[PDB]
Design a protein around this ligand. Structure first.
Ligand SMILES: OC[C@H]1O[C@@H](O)[C@@H](O)[C@@H](O)[C@@H]1O
Ligand SMILES: OC[C@H]1O[C@@H](O)[C@@H](O)[C@@H](O)[C@@H]1O
Ligand SMILES: OC[C@H]1O[C@@H](O)[C@@H](O)[C@@H](O)[C@@H]1O
Lengths: 861, 861
């Protein structure tokens, strides 16, 4: 009979395992309370109003006890006679976080110890007709591991200390458990050591054959043909004939062809492979390089009892090559898609929430749409988080956002015992199997920063030199095996047509990590470490930059969402709670960078804005430099894209999906055709024309040197033929070739790139820190007009207006552009999209600019 | 038209590359001399009488200059107009040893740097009609590498020093080149740093499609069914239709089924898979566990231009599992074939000649037949040699000799550069692809002794502690990547159904190497190191013993083959050359073990015989112990099986295929049903019954304690039901439960295992070293009788006669048994096979026994 699958998302309740100190302290949690599946006991507590929202003000501490406690889930469910007559009946847990003991009708069913693994167990023996009682006990990873850890000769160098002191310093349990690293707190997120059934639970029943998977293995793909192999993986309880039918539909939906294969399956696993050749394929390309065409593979399996079953895969035909060849700059690192070398433009992706089980499809999609809108073509799913929901990868496929997929290791030195290795191997197999058919997934990576940490971080270096050399060898061997062998083999076996990368940053264990002439780099000498000036970005040029960034505050709307009017000061206890860099004392670093460029902010609202400008302009410099240095560099992924929480971070989009100034800048410096004018610390401005086109660009570029009084000092226009997929230097100007005798504090330069009379890109360059400039007081005129859905807002400034920031108080609105420069007498129109009426928008409109913000600023302390 | 292939095995000639010092010194080599291909310039020189046979007496040194020289090969070959019309014309080199520069008609063709790789190159442009000149220059690996090595901060720990001083001590070039390690000399072989085109060269021409391989991929195999996939690999120059037919024949030649697959191929590589399911397969079993049944898969390809091509594979269906499970003794290591745990019985296989290109098919077959006849089921092809000829593996398949296949790394610490790694990777891919379809190949192993050397050998320990810790990490990472990742992936990708083993001995990088409770072991505390007594074998019991051994001299006939009557003294200049252990003082180690048991040999012939008895009895102890210890141990592979040259070694069969006493003993202690009676150094004799049967054994076993005067002291017989695949201890007897009051120097014990009225196995036990025994003067009678081809020779001794050795001077004859014990009045018949006449065999017959040999012995020094 038809394979049946019933989800158990009803009647769940949860309570503290009896006998714990937390039970006495929180008696409401000692009693049964409603529970959501999927969910977390933390959010169950919040929903039952037992604890306040941990995101709000300084409530974070008030929920910490939950992650130190043991929890007991319970649900009852009924199984009908047809289901119990079936030859196979199983319970499936897609996600247990993390140390779980499951009982069914009072006897043992399952032991689970990996947040990222699927657990299938034969339940038929233990099930009864009518009412069944399913219980799931979850144990605090901290409470379970710490007693063991305290007796060990050493604790492995881990991640972050507990700000609440419930784990010893430098003795982190997080290292020893397969659980999302960021749960234990990070320098942009709260400590939420979640416990929960955080994925679906199912009762599944089948008779002759269970279809366990379909994988469209791409053997070779080019313009002329695609040769693939549909691989059906079939679990059979008894030997017998099956017949497989395969329909292939193209991007439009028409049948591409039909294929059939008879086979005899035997008890256990069986693979039935069907070869498919697609002439002149409509291939899948990343964003900006074509369409995101996808084919649909539909397999039908009829078993020995005449029962038919369907399984579908929506996949994209594409070749992927990680090209590493020797050249002038050492050894390249290029993502090549369909024979096209793609300069990776994007950012690092972290979880969308501190509580991942409640993340909506809406937010998953808008996060990717954000990336697409800022002209990105790649996101790196950073290894300190969790593997995303299926739907996330679906939208990624659809939008053409390539995914650099870390396995979920975030920097901690892993233990080298076999059991941890084999536990992790099975995790890798299941995730690779689940995600491999997504065309957007173009690279697997073993971890984030483990090697570079081992080699470059003070604590790692001291540790590895403190232990006996033979113990050091055991530890290093464990890492090399896990990240060099185990993960590589899983990918080579199950997702063979995409490359693997031992560690980010690194050279795939060829040599040392974080090199400038081989592999990728995480550059944090700006912001972190010595905290060098942002112009130092111009002196660093790796073959691929996979991390770098600057911090900023979220939107004013987001600030008011977690803070009250009395809290509006970066040094307030509430703002410090929401600043997680450098043990809560992050503002000092943030203020270092703000003051450098803009001096001392007049008020809290100016502080937030200036913090965002600091971040935006700093990253603008680096990204433009990287792109302009092609083919020396071939990748820019800034830290970070998104937030898990309302608070200060390196994101360009905050927790509520609100664009910072950086994200608006990102669209520009990631634009397919871009002009880069970068003035370094020697007073030299290098101008480059960047084109990601696969065709030549017949361009013109202008250069105008302006007094801040409106007078033009010089005007220049030149022709340029930019090659496809390239960067061309068109000029290099000293300060004195530009200003001559003119005062650098009172002069600026405008750079424009054109195609015919269409302005493709523009950059405004200054010759002194903004705080020293004599910026003009701008009179900005604004006109409104309905335009389709929302409104067209036209801004016109009489003078130069730097970094114009539009906002509307608590009236929600999106803009097609923001944080832009207005040039004298040149009107700019931006699309306002809002549920609000025009009159409301007009009344609520606020127009901020750099000159007005700096005006009246107090001195630096 | 049909693919054509012309082998270039004719007109080859070779000479010193002009401009070398050797050209002046060896002018005969400066001028052209005939060259055989395949071959080596060394054997070319010998054939041209430029140097004498290096195997004979002490001539080894006279050919050393060849390995320090550069050589120029040349051959002419004709190409007709028809071959030049072809769409593709390529030259293929199956074996270049090693650093090769190839030119064709004076133009650059190929650079090669790996003895074990196949080189295919597009030659069509460079060819002309009529005579073509192919030139191959080969460069001495020593001459090429040493100048570079001399400038490096360190030399990697390698292999053996040069006895001729043409490489600095502990600075070996051999580590840095992919070349058979034993070529550079070993402790059982001469230094023959061969240069040569040592495998075939072909000109191949084809049009539409070239068949590049056929692989019968075994997906799952059991009693009920075998599911396989014939994988046809096709290189195409242009897109077009192909047609594939597959015929499958069962073990006698029956049609089991026929299959077809049409496809369109595209430029480059193409995969055509045909699924095949064989109901109730006749599976391949190793020797002693069933038949060696094989199926023949015959594939035919017809392309788009009407060209038909055929490829055949002879393969055996078998499941293979390396089972490692936790038990009382740690973690097991057992080879499981078709669900049957096989106790591995065998030895380590090394190259069959110092010049591998001249090895005959006959010698390949007799070596494996040697193994089969001595009741072995596995040979380990040791990593210091070379991957064998195809024919060797065919015979292995046929005879049921499992092959433990080392990759050809012999112990040296490899360099960690990418270039060496990728060169080695392609080597691994080609060798695995070449050998994977042989059912006898049941395990791949990364190397011999690299890890255990690094951890336990004094020089390695000092070296690794001598470099900066970061440099140590680089070297270790290179090893772990090469042996843990690269080889593993190659095996997992191309030969998925057989296990991989990082290093021998080791725990597959799970932990340290050479453990007693995990993985396999090379035990050399006996013979090597402290040179402990052979009874220490009874105190060492690893989960798998993959190396152990004792040295001995070859047959007297073989000795006379390399030495003259004046050379017959272990300390003579010739015999020292032929002793390669411990540089020049190997004789001291050998005499230590001989003197321990037998005192001082009276003459050279007694020395050879006693050296062989020492070896045979010593290995008997260990091998019997290991088998009797099941399931603690599950493997016995003694070092070594064979020789590369006439001389002293740890072999049981010498260079001319002549059995030592050890091989005759091997047949007995590897027998499927065996009785082990082992007396330890504490005066305790443990008796065990060993059965490799897959069915119960209803046995009786006897024990008799005898005076050397012939009187019986006691007689005992017991019933026993021995379980399948097991060992059963049936007794443990003190010296005093056996002898009571009797003098241990004048009494012995006989242990026998019977099934019904058939004697399966016997062991004779003594209670004191042989030199201290009062063995009786044996009068041994001999009777001859014709039977078909050879003769039946019946031996009858009036008293106990120990270790009787039959020989016939220089008259060649083989024996069905030798080196046996004769019991008083009990006749033994051995079959003599010889071309000789009866009268001459009778005249030439020499019969030696232990007592007569010890009689007249001089005192020890
Ligand atoms: O190592 C410093 C940076 O490294 C990244 O991988 C992230 O962990 C960031 O949150 C962090 O600021
Ligand atoms: O090949 C890598 C390098 O190391 C050794 O092999 C030497 O032969 C060098 O000539 C070579 O350049
Ligand atoms: O190292 C001692 C032994 O190790 C083995 O691997 C072989 O190389 C033997 O020739 C040698 O006697």
């Amino acid at each position: 009979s038809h394979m049946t699958a019933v989800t158990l998302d009803g009647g769940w309740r949860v309570r503290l395992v009896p006998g714990q100190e937390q039970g006495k302290t929180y008696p409401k949690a000692a009693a049964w309370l409603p529970a959501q599946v999927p969910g977390a006991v933390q959010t169950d507590l919040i929903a039952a109003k037992i604890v306040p929202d941990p995101f709000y003000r300084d409530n974070e501490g008030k929920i910490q006890w939950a992650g130190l406690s043991d929890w007991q889930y319970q649900t009852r469910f009924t199984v009908d006679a047809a289901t119990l007559k079936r030859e196979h009946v199983e319970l499936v847990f897609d996600g247990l976080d993390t140390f779980a003991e499951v009982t069914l009708n009072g006897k043992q069913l399952l032991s689970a110890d990996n947040m990222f693994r699927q657990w299938r167990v034969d339940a038929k023996s233990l099930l009864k007709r009518g009412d069944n009682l399913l219980e799931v006990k979850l144990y605090s990873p901290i409470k379970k591991i710490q007693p063991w850890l305290a007796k060990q000769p050493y604790a492995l160098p881990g991640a972050y200390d507990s700000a609440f002191g419930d784990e010893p310093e430098a003795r982190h349990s997080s290292t020893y458990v397969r659980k999302a690293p960021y749960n234990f707190g990070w320098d942009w997120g709260p400590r939420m050591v979640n416990a929960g059934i955080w994925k679906d639970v199912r009762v599944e029943a089948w008779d002759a054959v269970r279809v366990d998977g379909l994988h469209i293995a791409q053997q070779r793909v080019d313009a002329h043909s695609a040769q693939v192999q549909a691989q059906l993986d079939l679990q059979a309880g008894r030997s017998g004939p099956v017949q497989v039918t395969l329909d292939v539909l193209g991007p439009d939906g028409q049948k591409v062809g039909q294929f059939t294969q008879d086979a005899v399956v035997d008890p256990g696993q069986n693979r039935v492979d069907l070869a498919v050749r697609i002439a002149n394929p409509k291939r899948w390309f990343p964003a900006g390089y074509g369409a995101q065409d996808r084919y649909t593979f539909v397999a039908s399996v009829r078993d020995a009892d005449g029962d038919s079953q369907q399984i579908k895969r929506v996949t994209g035909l594409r070749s992927v090559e990680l090209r590493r060849e020797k050249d002038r700059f050492g050894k390249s690192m290029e993502i090549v898609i369909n024979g096209i070398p793609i300069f990776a433009k994007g950012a690092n992706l972290i979880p969308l929430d501190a509580f991942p089980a409640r993340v909506t499809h809406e937010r998953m999609r808008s996060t990717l749409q954000d990336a697409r809108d800022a002209n990105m073509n790649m996101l790196r799913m950073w290894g300190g988080g969790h593997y995303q929901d299926d739907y996330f990868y679906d939208v990624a496929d659809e939008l053409g956002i390539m995914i650099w997929q870390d396995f979920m290791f975030g920097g901690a030195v892993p233990p080298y015992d076999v059991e941890f290795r084999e536990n992790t191997r099975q995790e890798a197999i299941e995730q690779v199997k689940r995600l491999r058919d997504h065309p957007s997934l173009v690279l697997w990576c073993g971890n984030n920063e483990v090697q570079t940490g081992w080699e470059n971080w003070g604590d790692r270096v001291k540790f590895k030199q403190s232990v006996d050399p033979e113990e050091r060898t055991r530890i290093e061997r464990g890492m090399t095996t896990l990240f060099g062998t185990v993960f590589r083999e899983v990918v080579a076996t199950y997702d063979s047509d995409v490359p693997y990368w031992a560690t980010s940053p690194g050279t795939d264990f060829d040599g040392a990590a974080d090199q400038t002439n081989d592999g990728d780099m995480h550059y944090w000498k700006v912001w972190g470490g010595p905290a060098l000036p942002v112009t130092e970005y111009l002196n660093v040029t790796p073959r691929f930059m996979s991390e770098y960034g600057l911090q900023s505050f979220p939107d004013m709307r987001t600030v008011r969402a977690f803070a009250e009017p009395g809290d509006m000061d970066p040094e307030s206890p509430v703002m410090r709670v929401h600043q997680k860099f450098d043990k809560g004392n992050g503002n000092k670093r943030l203020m270092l960078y703000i003051r450098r460029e803009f001096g001392e902010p007049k008020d809290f609202e100016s502080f937030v804005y200036l913090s965002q400008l600091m971040q935006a302009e700093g990253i603008n410099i680096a990204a433009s430099h990287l792109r302009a240095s092609r083919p020396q560099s071939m990748g820019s992924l800034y830290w970070q894209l998104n937030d898990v929480w309302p608070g200060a971070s390196w994101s360009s989009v905050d927790y509520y999906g609100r664009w910072k100034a950086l994200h608006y800048h990102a669209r520009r410096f990631y634009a397919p055709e871009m002009i880069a004018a970068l003035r370094n610390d020697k007073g030299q401005t290098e101008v480059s024309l960047v084109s990601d086109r696969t065709t030549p660009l017949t361009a013109r570029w202008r250069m105008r040197v302006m007094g801040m009084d409106g007078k033009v000092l010089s005007k220049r226009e030149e022709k340029a033929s930019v090659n496809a997929l390239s960067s061309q230097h068109v000029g290099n100007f000293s300060d004195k070739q530009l200003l001559g005798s003119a005062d650098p504090k009172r002069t600026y330069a405008v750079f424009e790139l054109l195609d015919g009379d269409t302005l493709l890109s523009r950059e405004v360059v200054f010759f002194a820190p903004a705080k020293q400039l004599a910026l003009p007081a701008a009179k900005i005129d604004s006109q409104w007009r309905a335009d389709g859905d929302g409104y067209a807002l036209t801004l016109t400034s009489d003078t130069l207006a730097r970094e114009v920031w539009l906002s509307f108080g608590d009236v929600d609105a999106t803009l097609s552009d923001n944080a832009f420069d207005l040039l004298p007498g040149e009107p700019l129109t931006v699309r306002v999209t809002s549920k609000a009426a025009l009159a409301q928008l007009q009344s609520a409109l606020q127009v901020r600019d750099l000159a007005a913000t700096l005006a009246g600023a107090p001195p630096e302390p």
